[PDB]
Amino acid sequence: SNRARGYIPPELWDPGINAGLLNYNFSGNSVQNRHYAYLNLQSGLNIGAWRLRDNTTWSYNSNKWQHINTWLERDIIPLRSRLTLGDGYTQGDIFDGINFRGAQLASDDNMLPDSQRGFAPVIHGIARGTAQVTIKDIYNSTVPPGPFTINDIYAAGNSGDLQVTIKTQIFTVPYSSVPLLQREGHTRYSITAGEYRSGNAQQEKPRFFQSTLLHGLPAGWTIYGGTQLADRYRAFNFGIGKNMGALGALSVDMTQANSTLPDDSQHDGQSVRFLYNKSLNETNIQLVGYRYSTSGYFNFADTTYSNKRGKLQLTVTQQLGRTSTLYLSGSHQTYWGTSNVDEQFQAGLNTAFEDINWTLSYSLDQMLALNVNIPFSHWLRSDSKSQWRHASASYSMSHRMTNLAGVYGTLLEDNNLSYSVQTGYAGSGSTGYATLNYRGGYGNANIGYSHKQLYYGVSGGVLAHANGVTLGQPLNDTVVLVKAPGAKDAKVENQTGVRTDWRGYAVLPYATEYRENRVALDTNTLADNVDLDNAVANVVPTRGAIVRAEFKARVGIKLLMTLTHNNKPLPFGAMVTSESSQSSGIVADNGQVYLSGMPLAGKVQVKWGHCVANYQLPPESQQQLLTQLSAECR
Amino acid sequence: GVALGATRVIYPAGQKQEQLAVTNNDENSTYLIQSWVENADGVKDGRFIVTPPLFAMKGKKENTLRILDATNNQLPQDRESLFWMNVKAIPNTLQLAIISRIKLYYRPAKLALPPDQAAEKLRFRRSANSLTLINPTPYYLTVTELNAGTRVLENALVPPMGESTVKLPSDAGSNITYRTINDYGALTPKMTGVME
Amino acid sequence: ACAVDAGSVDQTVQLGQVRTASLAQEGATSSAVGFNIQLNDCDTNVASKAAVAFLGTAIDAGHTNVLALQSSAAGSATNVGVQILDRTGAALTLDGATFSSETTLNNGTNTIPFQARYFATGAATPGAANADATFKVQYQ
Amino acid sequence: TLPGGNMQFQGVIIAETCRIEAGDKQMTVNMGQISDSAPVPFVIHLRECSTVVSERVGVAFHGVADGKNPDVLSVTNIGVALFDDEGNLVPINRPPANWSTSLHFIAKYRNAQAWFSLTYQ
């Protein structure tokens, strides 16, 4: 059984640590016309594997503690799914997306390896002898004689035709893509039970059940079913999708709904949703989504109160000169009873040649817009270190006329201070804007002056883990807790303004779940007196997991020692240990050994396969970056 | 197996240290990593130090090598300098020890010509049976794809403010095309030779 | 009712460095970089849901869901593009009329996170990678 | 429905060196006992790198030289000779000479370690 490309056994996933999580976001708007305080607080507890989350809001005009959501989500590896208890929401690929409060058991696509996502036809067949089968080069390997099931084809959307060459029957596998399609032998399920929750107070709160199933039959077929039951609404949805290869892809689903109005009157309805994605022509990609709802068809949203005759969406995209992207979009909605029709046509031409990025958009009342983006890097030499090089000019004209010319970029060493000054004019209102955002290691502070409005906001996160309280940037689902005691002010890589504090603990706000992510400490901006045993770690967190990446740091001064035994350099591979600071190393060459974290005076022990070497260093060596000494061993 | 993060390392003058990654993705192999730096002629020199000089790696893991300057401002500030970084991965029978050599460009702060425009300023001189590359740029030039009509020539490396000689067949074409490698290790689009 | 946060209009996101090992053939991805669109002074009574539409140049006709890379005199990357994902992990198209996952608006400061990454449409060649997309905020 | 603004994505892409994967486990080519000799083949695979970077790779051999002949690796009165696929002798301690992603070499009698150097232009 060949493992999918990018597969990690579930035993290597870290559930997390027992920690309390807090995410505070405060905003103050002082508008002086010729004061609003908003505060969003997310509390949470990661006990065991569960994830208890709560959301609270506080406001003050110039006290109302209002809850929003309280939910306990958990990951079930045996079911390859996630369980949500409390207030949640349903995606509703076939039904309507609805918020609720109850038990939702849902399969997850992220838990699968990146190879088995989206739609990509699987290659069957038998190759005679030792054949180096080649797919045009997404996949390139051999296979023992017998039937082979290649299923590592990556999700490539529309694309073109995959040529399969066996080594020699040559057969091509053209394919299309529809979001409602699934791979062969793939099952997606979603069960939701509980009461219905909506923002509108007028709407009632009935208990409902929803079942959604997506199955991928062989040969590019997909069968998807759904059942929505309630006290007054009973609906069954059945749909089939087919991949026709060169011809395209098709998806048609019919939903029969017996719905009860706010009045006792009972109605029956059927709705047909037809989706067609044209394949590549000539260049041009077309999406046609049509929905025909006969008289008497209602959704669960309308049933829980105290029609649409037809909808047509047509999107055509064409690329010309490899630079210009013609985007045409047409929406047309009819109504039952009322003969008024809602139409919306949007055509855009975007082109980015050299560094200039210019976009001309038109929409239907009509609205036309021209946007020009010019990074400053075009003119001044990139060799120059002037901060002004990290800037760009945006010029926008919208037809009432709206002109907006602004400069924006970064001007700090670590690209933390993001500044944006944009003058504008509406036709005669002259309302310029200016904003300064700071993303440091203790929180994000954004302050803005609009010509008068003054915004000032602070967003941050508090992590009460085992080793004390750590403050950092606002937390986004999975967070990586980096623990490197003794290494103050160590900037992490590939992130802006994420620095270790005096405690030595920092937080990476984002790390992709169920994937291999690299956590590295940039030793370039790290103190000379501190040396890391390993500056890089890898962790694969789960959804809402606080994973700890551990890095040990030696706090003493670095030191290179030349050791000679019997007036002869120590042999290769000799182990040098120092109990003075619990340090270890291996002799490199010519009897030279490197040791991180060594005291001023001590004695090292040498094992070739048992010798002692005393050594002392003057205090001048401490002030030096790298000290070298020679010490003959006994 | 062992792998280096980058193919060439740019060391700006004034910066205390530089970072380079060394990766291994074979979970069932023990690797003793040794590192050092040699001069342009391949002779071990103390002008640069690599930390750690030697260490051990087990399983799928990567480490960070730190390059420290020790020239103590004993190099010119008008042209770049060349060094070779060597990384060895130690695992009857023969044992195979793999040593990889990469380029190290010590680059001063003040420079008139930005690195990108140096490629287009290269000049050529056609002798009786050899071609000489005059390079008045302050950057090392790694010239490849040196095609002469229907005859392709050998690749060359020209130090700044200098000339390098390559062989030239008599049947080589009049027009000469060449490509340059940037700091990221990618070939610049083909450019014609500006004969003087 | 609500107004898009000032400063969020002009936002720059750094994707760091990605080695060519992670981008081998078409379909390969890279690490993800978090970013968000801020909303302030929102009145839920007028509008209760929010959606975002992205408009930007496509790298090629068959990969409209992937941005295009601006040419640079220092040498831009080839056969690589920038991909944008919503909070649900699904790729977002750049046709200019595809609204993302509608999120419930709340009183006070509202944050709608998104992710960005590198998508390999072919052989990966090193160099600079500069792209830009125009985003539209829609209120319902 | 109001315009949002522009959002720029900036980054850099860097190449990487070709990883070396010898055919034998732990890069340990077993040769055999001794009573040239029977050939012993070993394969090297340059993986996870673009063809342009792999093409511009200078491969060379150097190591401990035998006293009798400096061009043969030291091991009685014998040595290990390395030949390419073409069969021509490749002397040890020689300047690089460019030789696709799969290299093949033969060892013959006539233990040791051989520094296998790959310079990246």
Side-chain angles (χ1 to χ4, degrees), chain A, chain B residues 1-87 89-196, chain C, chain D:
Chain A
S1 62
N2 170 57
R3 285 301 190 170
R5 183 182 298 118
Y7 157 79
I8 306 104
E11 282 72 58
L12 308 183
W13 299 342
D14 298 337
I17 68 182
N18 301 3
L21 181 142
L22 192 141
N23 195 354
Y24 66 94
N25 196 356
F26 170 86
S27 177
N29 188 6
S30 290
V31 180
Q32 197 174 1
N33 45 311
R34 203 56 54 184
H35 311 269
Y36 297 143
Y38 315 102
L39 172 61
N40 195 296
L41 181 64
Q42 167 189 357
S43 307
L45 180 60
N46 294 4
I47 178 167
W50 306 87
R51 275 83 173 177
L52 179 136
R53 309 292 179 180
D54 185 2
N55 198 1
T56 310
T57 293
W58 188 81
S59 300
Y60 177 76
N61 295 2
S62 306
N63 300 355
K64 294 297 179 182
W65 294 92
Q66 175 184 358
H67 294 279
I68 306 189
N69 322 306
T70 62
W71 78 83
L72 280 82
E73 52 174 357
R74 186 206 170 76
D75 44 347
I76 316 185
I77 301 309
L79 274 302
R80 271 301 200 287
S81 300
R82 70 177 68 260
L83 163 65
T84 298
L85 306 171
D87 200 298
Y89 81 108
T90 287
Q91 297 174 336
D93 196 4
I94 53 180
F95 285 95
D96 303 295
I98 55 172
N99 316 302
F100 66 93
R101 168 195 288 271
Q104 163 181 357
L105 171 62
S107 177
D108 197 7
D109 295 356
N110 298 358
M111 264 188 277
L112 259 60
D114 190 276
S115 182
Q116 305 166 320
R117 288 231 298 175
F119 178 85
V122 289
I123 315 296
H124 311 273
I126 306 189
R128 297 181 188 175
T130 308
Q132 39 172 1
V133 288
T134 301
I135 300 183
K136 309 300 182 179
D137 300 338
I138 308 183
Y139 160 79
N140 195 301
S141 178
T142 69
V143 55
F148 58 93
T149 58
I150 301 173
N151 54 61
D152 62 355
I153 309 99
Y154 273 92
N158 282 286
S159 295
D161 57 299
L162 319 174
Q163 187 204 66
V164 187
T165 298
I166 78 175
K167 303 165 191 173
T168 59
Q169 169 201 0
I170 319 297
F171 61 95
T172 174
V173 189
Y175 70 105
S176 302
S177 62
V178 163
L180 303 171
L181 293 197
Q182 297 293 120
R183 286 171 180 269
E184 302 205 349
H186 193 279
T187 305
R188 266 194 54 193
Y189 80 108
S190 175
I191 292 184
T192 291
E195 307 183 60
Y196 168 82
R197 294 289 178 182
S198 180
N200 192 10
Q202 302 177 2
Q203 309 201 2
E204 314 169 0
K205 298 163 176 53
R207 46 189 55 254
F208 80 102
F209 175 88
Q210 156 161 356
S211 174
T212 293
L213 176 68
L214 295 170
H215 198 290
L217 279 197
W221 293 74
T222 294
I223 312 298
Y224 52 98
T227 290
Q228 194 163 55
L229 194 144
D231 295 295
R232 289 191 181 178
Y233 183 83
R234 306 185 62 108
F236 302 97
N237 185 10
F238 182 86
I240 59 179
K242 167 63 165 59
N243 180 16
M244 313 175 304
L247 317 172
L250 181 64
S251 296
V252 288
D253 51 351
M254 169 182 299
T255 315
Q256 193 267 7
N258 299 115
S259 52
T260 298
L261 279 181
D263 196 5
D264 302 2
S265 61
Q266 312 178 62
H267 287 189
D268 186 7
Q270 292 99 301
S271 74
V272 164
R273 185 166 56 190
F274 148 79
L275 178 63
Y276 177 85
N277 178 7
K278 184 53 197 176
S279 57
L280 265 64
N281 281 357
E282 311 178 62
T283 311
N284 300 358
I285 285 180
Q286 317 179 5
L287 320 176
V288 177
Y290 178 70
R291 173 174 273 275
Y292 184 93
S293 313
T294 196
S295 311
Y297 179 85
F298 302 87
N299 293 297
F300 190 39
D302 296 339
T303 307
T304 177
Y305 286 161
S306 300
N307 305 140
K308 323 292 185 60
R309 180 169 181 182
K311 180 178 182 56
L312 189 147
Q313 280 192 357
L314 191 148
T315 297
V316 168
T317 173
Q318 165 171 359
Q319 192 206 14
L320 68 95
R322 94 187 61 85
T323 52
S324 309
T325 49
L326 310 182
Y327 293 142
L328 317 173
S329 176
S331 172
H332 173 275
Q333 170 173 60
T334 55
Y335 283 86
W336 278 118
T338 300
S339 294
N340 211 356
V341 175
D342 292 358
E343 298 165 356
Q344 196 159 2
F345 183 48
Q346 181 189 3
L349 193 151
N350 190 8
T351 310
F353 62 97
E354 271 78 9
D355 290 298
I356 321 293
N357 179 291
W358 70 285
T359 310
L360 190 59
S361 181
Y362 171 81
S363 302
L364 162 69
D365 183 74
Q366 311 186 4
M367 195 270 288
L368 188 135
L370 162 68
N371 288 57
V372 176
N373 212 3
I374 306 180
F376 270 102
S377 301
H378 188 269
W379 298 293
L380 78 163
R381 319 153 61 243
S382 299
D383 197 3
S384 172
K385 270 83 60 184
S386 170
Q387 306 162 0
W388 263 84
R389 81 189 179 287
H390 291 275
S392 304
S394 69
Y395 184 78
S396 66
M397 177 174 325
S398 173
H399 293 90
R400 290 181 181 173
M401 294 190 56
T402 312
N403 298 319
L404 197 148
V407 193
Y408 69 102
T410 77
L411 76 162
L412 194 62
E413 163 190 358
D414 215 6
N415 300 65
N416 293 320
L417 194 58
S418 176
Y419 80 112
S420 172
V421 177
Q422 40 185 355
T423 72
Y425 174 83
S428 60
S430 54
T431 61
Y433 297 89
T435 41
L436 285 80
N437 303 317
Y438 170 66
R439 281 189 43 188
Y442 279 85
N444 296 4
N446 55 322
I447 176 165
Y449 156 84
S450 172
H451 178 270
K452 167 179 175 180
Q453 298 182 58
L454 180 72
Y455 293 99
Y456 47 99
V458 291
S459 308
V462 175
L463 285 86
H465 46 100
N467 291 155
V469 163
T470 301
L471 318 180
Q473 297 201 302
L475 313 175
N476 183 12
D477 299 303
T478 79
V479 287
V480 167
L481 200 152
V482 293
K483 161 184 172 184
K488 317 171 180 303
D489 204 333
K491 182 198 65 180
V492 309
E493 280 202 6
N494 298 1
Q495 288 188 12
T496 64
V498 183
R499 323 189 69 119
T500 53
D501 48 356
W502 66 287
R503 270 269 193 179
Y505 310 80
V507 290
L508 273 68
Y510 182 48
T512 306
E513 48 204 63
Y514 319 100
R515 294 291 176 276
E516 201 83 20
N517 48 64
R518 173 177 79 115
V519 169
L521 269 74
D522 190 358
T523 61
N524 192 7
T525 182
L526 192 150
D528 50 359
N529 205 5
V530 180
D531 186 71
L532 305 157
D533 277 354
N534 280 295
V536 174
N538 281 347
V539 285
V540 189
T542 309
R543 181 56 168 282
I546 304 190
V547 286
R548 285 189 310 175
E550 183 162 356
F551 320 94
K552 200 61 182 180
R554 311 296 174 175
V555 67
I557 61 192
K558 304 177 295 297
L559 172 68
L560 192 149
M561 296 185 60
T562 305
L563 281 76
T564 44
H565 190 260
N566 297 318
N567 215 5
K568 177 247 290 180
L570 266 291
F572 188 91
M575 298 291 298
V576 175
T577 174
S578 67
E579 297 179 1
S580 308
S581 64
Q582 202 190 299
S583 307
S584 181
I586 308 182
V587 176
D589 46 351
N590 313 118
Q592 302 171 5
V593 61
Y594 154 80
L595 290 177
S596 59
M598 299 291 297
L600 281 81
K603 45 179 50 58
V604 293
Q605 308 173 356
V606 182
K607 305 295 185 241
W608 43 79
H610 292 267
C611 183
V612 292
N614 189 359
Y615 85 106
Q616 194 267 356
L617 263 189
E620 300 171 357
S621 294
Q622 170 197 242
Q623 304 143 357
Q624 197 58 256
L625 196 144
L626 190 148
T627 304
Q628 306 180 240
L629 66 86
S630 306
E632 176 177 357
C633 201
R634 177 184 60 78
Chain B
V2 72
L4 274 301
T7 66
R8 63 213 50 197
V9 179
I10 302 290
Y11 201 99
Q15 195 166 205
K16 189 56 68 164
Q17 75 163 301
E18 262 296 325
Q19 182 170 356
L20 179 55
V22 163
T23 73
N24 168 34
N25 55 358
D26 205 3
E27 51 269 30
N28 301 99
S29 50
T30 317
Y31 278 121
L32 270 298
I33 293 291
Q34 174 184 9
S35 299
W36 68 81
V37 168
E38 302 169 355
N39 58 357
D41 314 323
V43 181
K44 294 188 62 178
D45 195 66
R47 263 163 286 179
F48 278 132
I49 292 284
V50 286
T51 293
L54 192 140
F55 54 94
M57 302 173 35
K58 187 262 183 181
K60 170 205 299 280
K61 193 73 76 65
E62 62 184 359
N63 271 114
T64 283
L65 294 176
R66 310 178 36 198
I67 296 174
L68 303 151
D69 183 8
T71 64
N72 211 2
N73 319 297
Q74 293 313 124
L75 289 184
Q77 273 60 48
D78 75 317
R79 320 151 166 203
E80 261 178 3
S81 291
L82 174 58
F83 294 99
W84 288 102
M85 173 156 173
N86 297 327
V87 174
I90 302 181
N92 283 319
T93 183
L94 169 71
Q95 191 175 180
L96 296 186
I98 294 308
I99 178 169
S100 304
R101 313 184 62 246
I102 67 180
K103 295 184 173 177
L104 193 79
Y105 292 154
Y106 181 89
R107 169 180 305 168
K110 300 200 301 177
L111 276 158
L113 287 174
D116 43 352
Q117 312 175 3
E120 82 171 2
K121 280 300 304 308
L122 182 72
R123 291 311 167 247
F124 294 88
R125 189 188 67 192
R126 181 169 212 170
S127 68
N129 60 350
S130 65
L131 187 65
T132 304
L133 289 87
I134 300 98
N135 187 11
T137 62
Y139 283 79
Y140 286 94
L141 274 194
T142 315
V143 286
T144 60
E145 207 73 16
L146 193 46
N147 195 358
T150 190
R151 169 78 43 160
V152 61
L153 311 180
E154 61 270 59
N155 301 340
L157 178 72
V158 182
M161 316 325 278
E163 304 169 1
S164 297
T165 305
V166 295
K167 282 185 156 200
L168 175 73
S170 58
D171 72 315
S174 299
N175 206 274
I176 319 295
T177 61
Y178 71 97
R179 308 193 66 180
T180 313
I181 315 190
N182 51 23
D183 292 339
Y184 313 111
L187 296 180
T188 303
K190 177 226 304 175
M191 288 209 173
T192 174
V194 184
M195 272 307 301
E196 67 182 1
Chain C
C2 201
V4 286
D5 177 72
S8 301
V9 176
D10 298 351
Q11 179 182 61
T12 297
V13 183
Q14 177 180 56
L15 281 73
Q17 315 199 1
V18 169
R19 318 169 293 129
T20 186
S22 304
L23 314 180
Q25 74 273 357
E26 186 168 299
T29 59
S30 79
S31 302
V33 174
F35 68 98
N36 48 359
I37 309 177
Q38 206 74 261
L39 295 180
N40 292 301
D41 295 298
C42 280
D43 205 4
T44 48
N45 311 298
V46 185
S48 62
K49 299 178 177 188
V52 178
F54 281 92
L55 195 146
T57 298
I59 183 64
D60 205 309
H63 288 110
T64 51
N65 53 1
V66 173
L67 291 183
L69 268 298
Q70 311 162 322
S71 281
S72 57
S76 305
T78 78
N79 291 3
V80 187
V82 189
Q83 185 179 2
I84 304 102
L85 324 171
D86 61 349
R87 69 181 194 120
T88 76
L92 307 175
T93 81
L94 272 301
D95 303 359
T98 305
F99 291 151
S100 64
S101 303
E102 268 80 2
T103 316
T104 302
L105 200 77
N106 303 303
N107 282 305
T109 286
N110 294 292
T111 306
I112 316 182
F114 299 97
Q115 279 69 239
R117 74 191 190 188
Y118 281 115
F119 191 73
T121 65
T125 298
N130 306 0
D132 50 353
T134 63
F135 79 106
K136 331 292 295 184
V137 167
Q138 196 268 330
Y139 276 104
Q140 288 174 56
Chain D
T1 316
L2 74 163
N6 307 300
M7 197 176 304
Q8 188 176 178
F9 291 134
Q10 291 179 351
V12 295
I13 301 185
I14 51 182
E16 88 166 4
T17 51
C18 297
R19 191 173 292 101
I20 300 311
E21 299 179 355
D24 291 331
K25 308 174 302 178
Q26 296 306 115
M27 299 189 277
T28 315
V29 187
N30 191 1
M31 205 163 188
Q33 308 300 299
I34 182 70
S35 67
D36 286 357
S37 75
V40 178
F42 54 101
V43 287
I44 309 190
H45 310 326
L46 276 74
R47 314 285 206 190
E48 203 72 27
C49 62
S50 62
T51 174
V52 169
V53 172
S54 67
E55 195 267 356
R56 314 189 188 287
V57 164
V59 171
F61 284 95
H62 51 104
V64 178
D66 193 294
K68 307 293 296 181
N69 194 0
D71 285 1
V72 59
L73 294 170
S74 180
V75 292
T76 175
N77 297 60
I78 50 175
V80 177
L82 298 174
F83 304 143
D84 202 1
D85 45 10
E86 307 161 63
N88 308 304
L89 164 62
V90 183
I92 66 177
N93 320 303
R94 290 297 170 185
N98 194 4
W99 279 291
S100 199
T101 190
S102 63
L103 309 178
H104 301 285
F105 298 94
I106 303 294
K108 301 178 188 180
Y109 270 105
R110 204 212 67 180
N111 72 303
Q113 277 67 239
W115 295 96
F116 191 78
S117 73
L118 285 77
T119 181
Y120 284 90
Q121 195 187 5

